[PDB]
Amino acid sequence: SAFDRDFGYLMPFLDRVAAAASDLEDASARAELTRLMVEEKARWQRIQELLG
Amino acid sequence: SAFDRDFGYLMPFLDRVAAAASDLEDASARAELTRLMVEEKARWQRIQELLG
Ligand SMILES: Cc1cc2nc3c(=O)[nH]c(=O)nc-3n(C[C@H](O)[C@H](O)[C@H](O)COP(=O)(O)O)c2cc1C
């Protein structure tokens, strides 16, 4: 509840960061950020399970 | 970076979720969220490096 506003910003933000992952010219940076955003989605699902 | 304003809000948000971990009632959820927020902090500092 107290975090519904913050998740309201957070979820499009994760979408934008995973979308910006494709735009990195560097291949290592693109691979790391793409894997990190995949991990971040599962993490944030678990985090809001814990908060809820 | 079109994420500069985002991170200015993202890191205080991570702090608030770390503080809210302490007020969870199941102790295992408290431990799990605390550890999660620590990692979230380190990981988003990295992601902010990859976006620059
Ligand atoms: C990634 C992210 C970006 C945010 N960006 C903004 C923003 O640009 N403007 C804003 O007012 N709140 C933003 N927020 C929400 C703030 O963290 C916070 O909920 C808001 O300032 C309301 O504060 P209050 O609870 O004291 O009213 C963002 C949250 C996150 C997680």
Curated annotation (Swiss-Prot), chains A, B:
GO terms for biological process: intracellular iron ion homeostasis. Its main location: other. It is found in: Encapsulin nanocompartment. The keyword Iron applies. Fe cation 2 binds at E40. GO terms for cellular component: encapsulin nanocompartment. The encapsulin and a cargo construct (an encB-encC-encD fusion) can be overexpressed in E.coli and in human HEK293T cells. In HEK293T in the presence of 0.5 M ferrous ammonium sulfate nanocompartments can be detected and used as cell markers. Coexpression of this nanocompartment with a larger nanocompartment from Q.thermotolerans (AC A0A0F5HPP7) allows of expression of different sized iron-rich particles. The encapsulin shell proteins are not seen to mix. Fe cation 1 binds at E40. Keywords: Encapsulin nanocompartment, Iron, Iron storage, Metal-binding. One of its GO terms (molecular function) is metal ion binding. Cargo protein of a type 1 encapsulin nanocompartment. May help nucleate Fe atoms in the interior of the encapsulin nanocompartment. Present in about 47 copies/encapsulin nanocompartment. This is Encapsulin nanocompartment cargo protein EncD. It comes from Myxococcus xanthus (strain DK1622). The lineage of its organism: Bacteria, Pseudomonadati, Myxococcota, Myxococcia, Myxococcales. The gene is encD. The chain holds residues 8 to 59 of 109 of the full protein.
